[PDB]
Amino acid sequence: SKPEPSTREQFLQYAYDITFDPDTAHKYLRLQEENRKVTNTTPWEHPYPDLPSRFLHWRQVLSQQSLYLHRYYFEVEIFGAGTYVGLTCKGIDRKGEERNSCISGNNFSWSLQWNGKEFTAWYSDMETPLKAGPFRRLGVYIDFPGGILSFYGVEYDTMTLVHKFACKFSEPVYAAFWLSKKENAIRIVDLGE
Ligand SMILES: [Cl-]
């Protein structure tokens, strides 16, 4: 196993293309920019086909890509109180009304919330208030073999650690996004250039 990354340049060696999966998106979420932008447009709903994959209650969407057995890095730009960014497993219950169907409410999902005043780390209904931020751009690092999920505030070439989770990774994971409030928006940064 390599040295852990330190500089933005080192994280960018693990740059991985993420896109939102329209088959998962809650109807109150609009996808744009070739599935690299998601907005909560409540009360404007979008005519997605009914699918078993689609979230019913929670305003969530997953990545098309799964992450399994390597190191990965992607950046997102986030806007609005009530956004969560994290990881989950395919088995997350898409139709569930309970918090076990949201990415802050079960033992196989890990997430970072911006609540309007602070960042908060979530795992299985347990919350950890955090000091760092706010930051409009986050870097999300997944070391699948090393059982690490870490979030950084990115400003120019500076990276400020927001939180580092220790994760017991077994299954493939998906990036997971929850836009709980009207006008919440998340863009996947094109790290291509
Ligand atoms: Cl919601």
Residue numbers in the entry: 358 to 550
The authors write:
TRIM family members typically contain a RING domain usually catalyzing ubiquitin transfer; one or two B-box domains mediating protein–protein interactions; and a large coiled-coil domain region, which is involved in self-association or oligomerization with other TRIM E3-ligase proteins. About two-thirds of human TRIM proteins feature a PRYSPRY domain, also known as the B30.2 domain, in their C-terminal region. All characterized family members shared the same overall PRYSPRY twisted β-sandwich fold consisting of a 7-stranded and a 6-stranded antiparallel β-sheet.
Moreover, TRIM16 has been reported to act as a scaffolding protein that facilitates autophagic degradation of protein aggregates. For the TRIM16 structure, CASTp failed to detect a pocket in the canonical substrate-binding site due to its shallow nature. The binding site generally tends to have a shallow topology, and conventional pocket analysis software failed to detect a sizeable pocket at this site in some cases for TRIM16. This does not, per se, mean that small-molecule ligands cannot be identified, as demonstrated by the recent discovery of ligands for TRIM58. However, developing high-affinity binders is expected to be particularly challenging for those family members.
